Design a protein around this ligand. Sequence first.
Ligand SMILES: *[C@@H]1O[C@H](CO)[C@@H](O[C@@H]2O[C@H](CO)[C@@H](O[C@@H]3O[C@H](CO)[C@@H](O)[C@H](O)[C@@H]3O)[C@H](O)[C@H]2NC(C)=O)[C@H](O)[C@H]1NC(C)=O
Lengths: 274, 376, 100, 464
Amino acid sequence: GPHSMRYFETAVSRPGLEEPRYISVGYVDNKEFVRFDSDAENPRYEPRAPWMEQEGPEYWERETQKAKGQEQWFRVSLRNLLGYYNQSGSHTLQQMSGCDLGSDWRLLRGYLQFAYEGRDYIALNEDLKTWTAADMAAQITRRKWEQSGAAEHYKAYLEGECVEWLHRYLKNGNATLLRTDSPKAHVTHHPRSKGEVTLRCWALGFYPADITLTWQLNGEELTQDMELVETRPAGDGTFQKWASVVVPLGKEQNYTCRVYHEGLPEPLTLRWEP
Amino acid sequence: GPAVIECWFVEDASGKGLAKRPGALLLRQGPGEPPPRPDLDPELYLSVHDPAGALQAAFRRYPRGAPAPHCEMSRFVPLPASAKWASGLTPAQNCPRALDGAWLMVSISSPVLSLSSLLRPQPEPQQEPVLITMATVVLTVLTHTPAPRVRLGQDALLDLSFAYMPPTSEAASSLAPGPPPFGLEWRRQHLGKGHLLLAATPGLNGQMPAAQEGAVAFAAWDDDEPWGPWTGNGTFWLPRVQPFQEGTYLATIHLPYLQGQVTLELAVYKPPKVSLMPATLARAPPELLCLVSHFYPSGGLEVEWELRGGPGGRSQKAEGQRWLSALRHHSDGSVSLSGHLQPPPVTTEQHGARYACRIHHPSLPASGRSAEVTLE
Amino acid sequence: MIQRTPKIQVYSRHPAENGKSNFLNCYVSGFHPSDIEVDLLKNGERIEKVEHSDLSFSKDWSFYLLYYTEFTPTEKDEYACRVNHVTLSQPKIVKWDRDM
Amino acid sequence: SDVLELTDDNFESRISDTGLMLVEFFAPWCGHAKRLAPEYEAAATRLKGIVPLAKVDCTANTNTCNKYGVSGYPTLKIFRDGEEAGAYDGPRTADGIVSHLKKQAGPASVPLRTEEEFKKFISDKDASIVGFFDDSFSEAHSEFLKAASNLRDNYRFAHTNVESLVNEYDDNGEGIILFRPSHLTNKFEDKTVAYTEQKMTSGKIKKFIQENIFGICPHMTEDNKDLIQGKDLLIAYYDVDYEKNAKGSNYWRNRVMMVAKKFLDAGHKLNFAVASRKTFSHELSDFGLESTAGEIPVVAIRTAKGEKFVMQEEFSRDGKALERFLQDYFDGNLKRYLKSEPIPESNDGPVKVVVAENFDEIVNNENKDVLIEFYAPWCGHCKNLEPKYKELGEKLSKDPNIVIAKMDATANDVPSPYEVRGFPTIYFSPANKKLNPKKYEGGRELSDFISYLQREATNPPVIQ
Ligand SMILES: *[C@@H]1O[C@H](CO)[C@@H](O[C@@H]2O[C@H](CO)[C@@H](O[C@@H]3O[C@H](CO)[C@@H](O)[C@H](O)[C@@H]3O)[C@H](O)[C@H]2NC(C)=O)[C@H](O)[C@H]1NC(C)=O
């Protein structure tokens, strides 16, 4: 299946003489594996997954030095943005950067993006050459970055190093990142109103989180009324989800719940059972 | 008829940060001298001449007595388009000499209109009679639908029109008849997701990246006049809009070394239908479930509980513990949720006293929607 | 600016059996900005000593946390997650329902 | 060290003191100029003791900049003797600029003072034009130098007084011999060609050179490509490299000439050449030979008018594939190559899909009227018309004389007789008047169409 590496940087200004709080977190797949936090006394990058303990002190030195450089870059950026938008307490500047791979483990997409106040400010497009920028501040930024060939620098970083390091992290952490825990599924019965019964199809214990739960009536897809909740973490590294559908009491067995997941050789099919 | 539009001049302040400074745009009415503005820097007080007449026509219709539009301008240097699909618009490795001189991009935005214009101001302000800086409009791009709201599952028609008056040249006129080929780009950027939706170069039939999501555009010049000015249309048609297609749409008209962009905020909505039933199976009064079904967006829903009095009596905020369910999601991208009320043990008669839930949501009127428990 | 109100789910890590140990979760996600107040509630009162994950980050610029505590579900006891954020006119409460 | 700063005030004056100068006309805002800046300064420093490099900011100095017809930036022009002496179109790099001006620095015609120098001069990969004179005092010698200066950008000139040489290559101490490249010699033509007019003039020399410098089948390269392309011309593309595959490069070139000779001798008129599939991989896209690029040559023809014809058969080693191709061409039995999608399998109605390959078979089937819609996949008008245009096809699904047709004009070349300004553009080609087809320009409504087919349609229309 597909895989990704993403670094999320985040500066949050605080009202008063205080300095902005800068958190930088790296993810493989949806799994955190390194974190830096300005507030922590002795702010350095720490390993957040056990498979990163291999990297020696020279890795954390280089990475920690980059972080403190970014913190300074975010610090000045926050003040400038404060200027243009004319605000007085707390403001948020975010960067995301990384690379999606396909099942071939090859670059499927590269990312370099920013947001101010939870709104896209400027973004490197899919072509890794041009930028999208809505308002005039970001348009002015975009002309500067075009004239400095920022995109060329990032295309080269994302296209080579990003995948390089992602290959290394995938191999080193395979025992958990290339793990495929299969969903344990079961259907529940709940009386509703008059002559009606909610059938809830559960899926528990599944990694990765990518999952499809579908309901049928005589092998026919039920889309209009079907209710899903968002996939959610159990807290033990696995994931949970369910899908529900209303049916008359007595016509339960005409309905079937199929589940789709990586860990399944072929998709499960389920029904309510006394 | 604003006549004069107050505007912020944005400059890269010594690279230490952006800063805004007061200016104004005066749409030439023709007869009569301009109003003196000693409060303004003459370099940022512009007497705007628009041969195409798109800028000026945009504000003649502007509803008199409406709020002033937000206006920003800044200096810019012409660059070629770095996008592959737009490579044919400038197939040489040189820059036109016609673009010599200073350029300003103006961006005017309000609830009725969003506009972007490329101006060429003179290098120094006229000193008599009034200290004002003469400037001429080269390219104008604008939408009359800057914040369209679209019912989930309906088509969205995003207005776009533009005008171009070839910039004056030192010499060697094109002498080439006909409006020149342009480019049109429609893109969406919203909450970290971005897609080129449609690209086109009318006047050059090279292959363009496939249009996405059933999108098309009415991308054309309006006439074939051999000289200009020329006006055109770039209206975007997006069918059966779903929630994932909400957000900021960026439309850019590209001419050689000249880019004009306007943005639109597309909002998707579906109003919530509300019903009230006893949660338990006809259950210490039974727990009440206010079901709020099939609405978008998910934010904005407020669930109010009221105990409506019978004859004589009136509505009062109901008492007892209240909470919400989690969000439930559907196929179309809409959501449902349920509110919950546990009334306290009834300790008094209340003839006609019915419980009701009222919901409010941006899709609804101010009064909202409500339901009383169906006394079947 | 784009502010986003937190989406909430409250659920046990494993299917609740009465008297058996388990973990009560409150998943708060898809909110912006990051300042948020979350608290698990046992019969109205604040379950103190609740532990949370560190602030996490989504590709859409939104944040998410997982608040959790170990707990033994009985029949009479009722649990909830209380959340507050700038997007909300008042704190939002979501009651645990072991079938959801 | 430095680039010279020329202005409207001191251009005419300093343009003379040299005998050439590279002058860069620019504007500070041009990004192409911005990146050229350090490369041009690097060039100036290395060519300091040779040629001067000047720069003219045109925003300031409008007169001098218009004086030499500048339309874009950067424009680089060579000024020898303070007069326009052609532009520089090489790469905007220090290596490119110093390379080019070096050649331009030297004399138009190289004096060969010994036989050894002569032998060296003609051992070049390109041709040599050598003037043989007893001394410098003839009007003929003066004409040779005039021609040499005129055509120095295009050809290599030399002259000698060496007595042994003058007497072996002329019979009155006034001669010009054209020496073709040594590694290109063959049985189909002579190594050398003598100027045979009685009087020697710069004009007649140019004519002599043009008509005889390349022969029947030159090796086309980056240098000579401009001089070779222009008239009806066949190129056979392959791994032509005379420092690696000489035997191989000669073989295919010989086989091309062998076939060319057959047709040329018969009176047929066509120019021929060989060219590297590597050095010219770009030209293949115009023909569709990007994939086909191995040891076996690939062939395509480009007429002076613009038409292109591509050999489909594999180039047999015996030349018989090339013979058939060329036979079909001169008969007028080769269909022209055009950008096209894959023609589809069925193509049943009610509307007939039309790619450029099957265009003239459908749209130009005479005695059969055609309504052709040129559409683009992105156009909204074109989308609005689609269901109306299909309904029109259905109401005409019995009248075979009337065929409703469409073609994606973004994915398919539109033939010269037709022109698509914007979208959609709809043409109607009469039964017999296929040569001069006329536009629709009517209302885009079904009823407007069938009411229009009740008029221009020569045959009566079948409303269904
Ligand atoms: C840019 O192009 C679009 C698409 O052609 C234009 O939208 C179209 O505008 C016309 C009016 O100019 C609409 O015609 C409608 O006709 C009905 C029936 O008579 C009438 O009730 C409406 O009031 C309207 O006049 C048309 O429906 C609409 N959409 C299309 C054609 O799909 C747009 O106006 C153009 N913008 C320009 C020219 O600035």
